[PDB]
Amino acid sequence: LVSLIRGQVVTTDGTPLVGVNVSFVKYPKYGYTITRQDGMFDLVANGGSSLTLHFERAPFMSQERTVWLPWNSFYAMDTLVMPSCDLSGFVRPDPVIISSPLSTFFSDAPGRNPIVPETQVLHEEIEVPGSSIKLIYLSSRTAGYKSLLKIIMTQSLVPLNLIKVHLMVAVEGHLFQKSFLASPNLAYTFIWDKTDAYGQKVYGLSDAVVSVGFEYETCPSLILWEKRTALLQGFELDPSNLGGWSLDKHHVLNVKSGILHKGNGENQFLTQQPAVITSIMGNGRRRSISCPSCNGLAEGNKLLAPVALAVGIDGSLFVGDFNYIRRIFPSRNVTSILELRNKEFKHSNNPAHKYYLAVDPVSGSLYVSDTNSRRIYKVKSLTGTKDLAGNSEVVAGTGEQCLPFDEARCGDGGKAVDATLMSPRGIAVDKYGLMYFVDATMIRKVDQNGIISTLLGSNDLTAVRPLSCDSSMDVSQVRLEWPTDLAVDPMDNSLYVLENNVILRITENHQVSIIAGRPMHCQVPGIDYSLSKLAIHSALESASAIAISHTGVLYISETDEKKINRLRQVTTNGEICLLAGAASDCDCKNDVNCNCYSGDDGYATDAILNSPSSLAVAPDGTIYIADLGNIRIRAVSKNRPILNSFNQYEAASPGEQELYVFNADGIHQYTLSLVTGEYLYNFTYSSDNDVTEVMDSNGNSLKVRRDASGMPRHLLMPDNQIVTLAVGTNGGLKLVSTQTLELGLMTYNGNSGLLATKSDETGWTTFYDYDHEGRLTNVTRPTGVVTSLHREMEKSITIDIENSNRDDDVTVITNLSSVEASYTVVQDQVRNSYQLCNNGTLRVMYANGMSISFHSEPHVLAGTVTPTIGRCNISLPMENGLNSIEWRLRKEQIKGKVTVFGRKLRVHGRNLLSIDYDRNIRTEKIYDDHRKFTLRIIYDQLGRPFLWLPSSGLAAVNVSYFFNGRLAGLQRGAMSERTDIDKQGRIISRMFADGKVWSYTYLEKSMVLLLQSQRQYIFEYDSSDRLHAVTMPSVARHSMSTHTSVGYIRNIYNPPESNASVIFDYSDDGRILKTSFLGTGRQVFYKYGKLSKLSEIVYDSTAVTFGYDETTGVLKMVNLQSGGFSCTIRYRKIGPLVDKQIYRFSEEGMVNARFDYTYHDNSFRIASIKPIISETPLPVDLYRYDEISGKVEHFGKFGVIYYDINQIITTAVMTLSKHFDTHGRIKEVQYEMFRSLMYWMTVQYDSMGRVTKRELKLGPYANTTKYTYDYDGDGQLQSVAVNDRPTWRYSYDLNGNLHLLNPGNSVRLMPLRYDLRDRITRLGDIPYKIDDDGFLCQRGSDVFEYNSKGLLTRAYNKANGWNVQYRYDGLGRRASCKTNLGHHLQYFYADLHNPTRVTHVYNHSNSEITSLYYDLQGHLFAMESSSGEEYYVASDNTGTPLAVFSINGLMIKQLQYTAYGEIYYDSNPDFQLVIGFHGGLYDPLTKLVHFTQRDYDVLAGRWTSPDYTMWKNIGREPAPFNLYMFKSNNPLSNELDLKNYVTDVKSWLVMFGFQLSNIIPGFPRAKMYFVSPPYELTESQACENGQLITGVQQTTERHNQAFMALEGQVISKRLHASIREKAGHWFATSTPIIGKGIMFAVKKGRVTTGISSIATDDSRKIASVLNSAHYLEKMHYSIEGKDTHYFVKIGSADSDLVTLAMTSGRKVLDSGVNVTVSQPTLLINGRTRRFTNIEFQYSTLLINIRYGLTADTLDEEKARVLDQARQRALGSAWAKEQQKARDGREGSRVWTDGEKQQLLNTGRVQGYEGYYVLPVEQYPELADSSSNIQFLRQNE
Ligand SMILES: *[C@@H]1O[C@H](CO)[C@@H](O[C@@H]2O[C@H](CO)[C@@H](O[C@@H]3O[C@H](CO[C@H]4O[C@H](CO)[C@@H](O)[C@H](O[C@H]5O[C@H](CO)[C@@H](O)[C@H](O)[C@@H]5O)[C@@H]4O)[C@@H](O)[C@H](O[C@H]4O[C@H](CO)[C@@H](O)[C@H](O)[C@@H]4O[C@H]4O[C@H](CO)[C@@H](O)[C@H](O)[C@@H]4O[C@H]4O[C@H](CO)[C@@H](O)[C@H](O)[C@@H]4O)[C@@H]3O)[C@H](O)[C@H]2NC(C)=O)[C@H](O)[C@H]1NC(C)=O
Ligand SMILES: *[C@@H]1O[C@H](CO)[C@@H](O[C@@H]2O[C@H](CO)[C@@H](O)[C@H](O)[C@H]2NC(C)=O)[C@H](O)[C@H]1NC(C)=O
Ligand SMILES: *[C@@H]1O[C@H](CO)[C@@H](O[C@@H]2O[C@H](CO)[C@@H](O)[C@H](O)[C@H]2NC(C)=O)[C@H](O)[C@H]1NC(C)=O
Ligand SMILES: *[C@@H]1O[C@H](CO)[C@@H](O[C@@H]2O[C@H](CO)[C@@H](O)[C@H](O)[C@H]2NC(C)=O)[C@H](O)[C@H]1NC(C)=O
Ligand SMILES: *[C@@H]1O[C@H](CO)[C@@H](O)[C@H](O)[C@H]1NC(C)=O
Ligand SMILES: *[C@@H]1O[C@H](CO)[C@@H](O)[C@H](O)[C@H]1NC(C)=O
């Protein structure tokens, strides 16, 4: 094409000349330029060919300079200044060039984590109301984000004579020059502003030319130069033009650089993807020698034998097609230009008849050199004349072969035409027009005059020295053995020789050196470290051809003709890698049944070549291969989108299942579904190509209302809502707002475009700091938390990530090479490795020992432009640990259009599942390979799934949509739930299939949910749709608030007319830190360690530690320590899988346990469990599975049969048959023993899935009992009839409290009483007591002791004389139960998939172990004793045991329960059953059923504690609720949820018994929990999963998720409006003390504040006072409900009092913040002190500052706050102890009658004092905790 030249002309000193006439003459093209004051010359010339330039000046010598021009680039010419010394064996410069990585990383959740560590990028977002389209900010899409180039020119060792080092950097016309002095480890970092020489923005990717010169003391005039190329990222295109922000769905394609810039922040550098191979000439068949119809199109045109290739100055490819020389024009047409009369059809593949081509860059002359004719020819006419046989002229040679020892030296010194040649081989023509050629074993020159000479002069055997491995010697010392190909480097102007599998370089200074290949001089032990990526250390296997690109890249052809047929690439850095040609399993030359032609229109590295003979590099950088064996010319091109028949470009995202359509200019037209082919988004533009409308598939249009210049004004949302956009004078988006909400408020750093601040409606301001390079260095939050990023750019780029509040330091190390980008994420000694290879492979090597390898293939629909993960190879650290998953993609085309898109999932060559989409009928067929499962998903005209048609006669699921595409209703047979919406899109009605209607009324931020029973719930909201208050039907108002605190976000819930606050403290990343119950003082502290995983849980006097392995990072230990008692759980793992679980106890009587696990070969499936309880080995339980479905076929002694969705559990003795209805609900259970029916149950449901009828037969001879259930207007259980006779009646409060029941078997109707907080107070005559935290305290004479974690530690009754104590493990599970009546049991959890499931019970009274066996629904069905006894359990639809049968099929126990779980009949009370009502642990003493997180009272029919986490989502999903009610007062039916409407393939598969989790490693296992497990338990399972801190970790996750995706499209199953959710913010935000626009940072306990433009004057006053203060770390407490934080200031308060404009008292600011100035006098440990005290307070948040002058000020305040907290802890502990004595309850210590009386009268006991159990020195957070205090006398 066309190139641009730019250079400077200077004098001797360095002054630019004001008058130089720069001239150039080439073909008919003429031109000249005259330099100005700057001394710069700018010229336009044709690229590729060599151009000579003349310079004219008056008092200076007129000089000429010839240069090799790049094809279509901006050439920066060397500076012009207006020979005796010889450097041989001197050290050449070997620079290490490190470029800043490409911005390929982005965030999956910019709202959760905006930090991209590796590229130091800020990825932010703004959610807008009325649309799912977001506004995205990416800090790399700015002017401030510069391109870096670290050039390490010297190492630790400097050559002795080196004095000066010179540097040159050439980027887009710019020429940077700098001189340095010789120093060890000398480096310079070049910064590019992404502009050209004219100050214009450069888009995409650019090439930099780095030149390093070495000046020696021996010769100061000459400098040893070395040229290297580097890739620099330019400006990213801005598609949306919204003040530096983009629309989430709006993309742009850079057509020139081949980059897909997605609006969501995702950048796809398409040219950096695997290279593509295509056939440009030939059809694999030979043409006739006469060449008939050889003049036409190149593609498919028959060849004979392509032996030579050369690219002309025109861009034409000259083909040495044996007999004829054919020219391929840029128009892709072929014309024969020369016929060689000495070529015969027989000698086509003969090496003796092989000739070589070369193009002269001065004049486009083509030179031919035939080895057989012993001459060199020049083609006369390159257009081809009539007589083609005589279109050549002799350049060199007469035709006769001269003898090796010629006297006249084969005509040297004279004319080339008259001279004689030995055997001419490879030819190359220099920049100056000098012709070079290989003549037998030497290199000969043919100059401009026509005189022949010898460069590498042979026969001088005396001066010849063997080839030096490291140093470079002169031409005279070099001897050549079998040289073939020759080429000139268009960047160096050096000559490259291919000689006996070694490539050598001849510089312009006649210096020879090895560039590629390993000679026998230093073969072994030449290199001790062996394998390396360098070309010098890699041996060449039968090399045949060489080619050099204009960027100095060397390509080497290697052909063995048998199996080795490949093309390798050698980059400027000296690294060698495979470019094309896979290793063929078949012999191409010997084997007759062989095809060595494949891979065309696919990836080059996968393709199989056959005998490559010649290479040539095209103007665009594509490599041409003379594939002689396949009679074709093949092209290895950069991966690029191709213009289709419609003049459009197509790119795709397989992960999002989207296809993007762009016009010829790369402007985004449409987004279609990659599966469905239906339009998802349509983009319309203005005349200036500015985006004005985004129209989705549903008809929702988001209009961008613009100005005539394209300036954005506002967004017109699909609901006709206006979102105001205010762009600043710097061009940056300043404000995003609605008529009520301020969605975003942004400031920028000058005109760089770098986001300085970003605020939301809550007033939360985040501050961003960058370095001079525009890389993110700090992120400061209003919590005072700072995230810091530090870069160290060396041979490897290291980024250090630190947080001010945590010790979780993360470091990312990046090593970029020719083959791969290598990443290492380090957390202490735990190292995770990631490798992103050029072939498209992503390899993860986890610290745990497991490795995952994702492999890319071209997409079947989108082509080579989009690689897809079609293979996944997993490796576990074990004997048979290799696993493999495969996705096989297919297509069906009718009339050139896609009809069917098929995907098949395979494991070890077997089909598991097939997901096929038929575009004609709009159906998605999901089917099994063995006729077991079939599901059809029907899509509507808008491309939305609306109907799910399953097999086995199951009820179909169908959905309704509103006009805007939002889900309107769901239906599954007779069951349906519909909604109606406002004009505002708010739900106004909710209709159920039973006729139940809920109304939703909206009145000024308040919502009123009314039921037909006239029960009313009022939800009061914020502008941000977060709850302020909830009024219950009882008219009791619950209140909530959220506020930014110091180091966390505090969420407060206040019960009605109470100050007993329930607080949930969350970190900035959304992790729980503290759970507080201010009513009694209950606290749970959560700590996170160096691996960013849970490290400690502290509550009361109990400390739970989580130990991780120093190297693997896996959870090794969980240790609970509560004084003397210790409970330790230890794990051993095979990668992330548990293979050993140990239980250890410190207690005297308690027994230990061990569980050994084995896994099935080549899987993640558990094969066996071997238990050892109390050093007594138990029998091994074997697990057998179906390899196609993951179905458990055998477990222990039980066998499982699957038919449709029904299951049969069999043994030689028993058969348990479970029958399910069309809705997947249990309809019949049939338990048979010895071919006789022992138990049968039938369940019948109403339209809504409520149990209406249950028939039960308990025993083979017992009668059948019929139970009928009736529900009230709200679906609450009203009555229960036994054989059509009313037996039970239930009634409820307006709040849903059960206030009337028939207890047990009684006819009597008993009333239940409640308080305003819904806490029970009475059950008939029996009084109940619930504490201020909401926990069960007393039931008449029964006393209950619940700890801070909400676990029952002790329960007793002094009157009835019974006492029960419980012990728990570190994961919150009940470990033991011990009574004063002899009972002592221990519980174990051996099931890895169900960690809350009690699998084994150790009984201390008989020393026997009971093994519990559960069915596929989780219900108990069998038991096995270590004594040899076997029991068979009959369980109901809720998993409640109703009957037990002996080993001989005899009913030994029969239970009858009420609807709420109270036992009224027991045939054998002495037979103790561990599992009770609803599958929990039933206690006959307490009458409670224990589930790991909550306890259930069977007498009251409610939970013993509230689930305060309900408050988190009740605002988003408003519904009738009660904190204590059991299953919405429907205890026999499965809880009603939207999950009952099966709208996803994985959920349909689960129903059919399929367990994809067992066959697809990593696939999510379906959760089988009634009660949600505690945080630490779910965390202990998920901690083995890969972290997501860095960008490479997030890239890996995208690969994992895209591989596990089943359906082509998934619906958003939500019948509620989408709410903008913040991390750790649950409720309506309280006004912050740290105002909007104020920066607040707490680094190592030191406070620093900053101010932005938007900050108010009163907010700046608080900032000024808080600056330079010292925060009392870990010493912040909840005092009288207040979130009090302590600070100290060393100096006088005078300066700060002037700022506050006050002297003393209280002042109220504009925000409402209270400022109190006082001078208190404190008495701490007998020491009196008076100081100034400034207090800042808003609602519960309180910030206190103490002023001092001494250095001990911080230490004195620490001693003051701890003593005050000690007084609070002691005051509370003694009060609680006195209350225990008053109530008649058992105290913490055993007191005598005198001690007890002293406590009752005074409040304290003489000689006794409260001491900390957990030391306050290590646990300062427990300083005010009364539950951490123990009363002891001085005897200890
Ligand atoms: C942890 O370990 C603990 C052990 O350290 C463990 O506690 C022990 O648990 C077992 C099993 O539950 C207890 O044994 C039971 O004892 C029952 C009490 O009966 C006593 O009183 C009677 C007087 O009224 C005596 O006649 C009777 O004597 C019999 O037992 C003696 C053994 O001590 C023996 O030497 C005698 O020869 C004599 O046979 C005894 O002293 C007892 O009732 C009970 O038996 C029933 O249950 C067995 C299964 O558990 C059946 O195999 C057996 O056939 C019995 O069933 C019948 O009775 C039930 C209840 O009435 C009915 O539900 C049945 O349908 C059935 O009824 C039919 O048959 C009757 C005639 O047999 C007839 O009258 C009916 O009309 C009907 O036709 C069992 O042996 C043991 O005492 C506990 N030990 C201690 C120290 O606590 C604890 O459970 C473990 N915990 C966990 C969680 O695992
Ligand atoms: C699911 O499909 C059924 C059809 O099988 C839809 O039911 C129809 O609903 C209309 C009212 O909208 C009634 O007039 C028809 O009589 C119903 N058809 C029959 C015979 O079932 C139903 O609306 C769909 N459900 C949802 C929520 O999309
Ligand atoms: C909830 O309110 C009660 C009553 O206002 C507070 O209890 C009082 O606290 C003061 C100071 O500690 C004592 O002098 C009183 O004797 C207490 N009254 C009684 C009878 O308890 C209580 O501290 C408040 N709690 C919270 C969480 O703010
Ligand atoms: C600023 O301080 C005043 C006074 O301490 C707070 O007002 C008191 O609020 C309580 C509880 O709402 C009332 O019982 C008192 O009667 C109020 N006293 C006065 C004199 O107003 C006020 O709430 C504080 N401001 C904020 C936003 O926390
Ligand atoms: C290329 O060759 C075809 C014959 O195969 C001919 O029809 C066409 O006109 C040619 N085009 C050019 C570039 O002259
Ligand atoms: C920002 O981070 C760097 C990390 O090298 C640190 O040196 C610096 O003190 C930080 N500054 C702020 C704003 O805390």
Please report which band the strand proportion falls in: under 5%, 5-15%, 15-25%, 25-35%, 35-45% or over 45%: over 45%
The helix/strand class is mainly beta
- The tally of beta strands, per DSSP, is 143
How much helix, percentage-wise, in residues? under 10%
Query: CA-to-CA gap between the ends?
Result: 94 Å
Bound molecules: a molecule of 8 linked components (NAG-NAG-BMA-MAN-MAN-MAN-MAN-MAN), a molecule of 2 linked components (NAG-NAG), 2-acetamido-2-deoxy-beta-D-glucopyranose
Tally of separate helices? 9
Overall geometric form: globular
For the largest beta-sheet, the strand count, sense and barrel status come to: 59 strands, antiparallel
NHL repeats: 338-382, 408-452, 467-518, 540-567, 596-639
Extracellular side: 1-1836
YD repeats: 649-668, 685-705, 748-767, 768-790, 961-980, 1002-1020, 1021-1041, 1048-1065, 1066-1087, 1088-1105, 1108-1128, 1131-1151, 1159-1179, 1185-1202, 1203-1229, 1231-1244, 1245-1268, 1271-1291, 1292-1312, 1314-1334, 1346-1366, 1368-1388, 1414-1455
Subunit structure: Homodimer; disulfide-linked. Heterodimer with other teneurins.
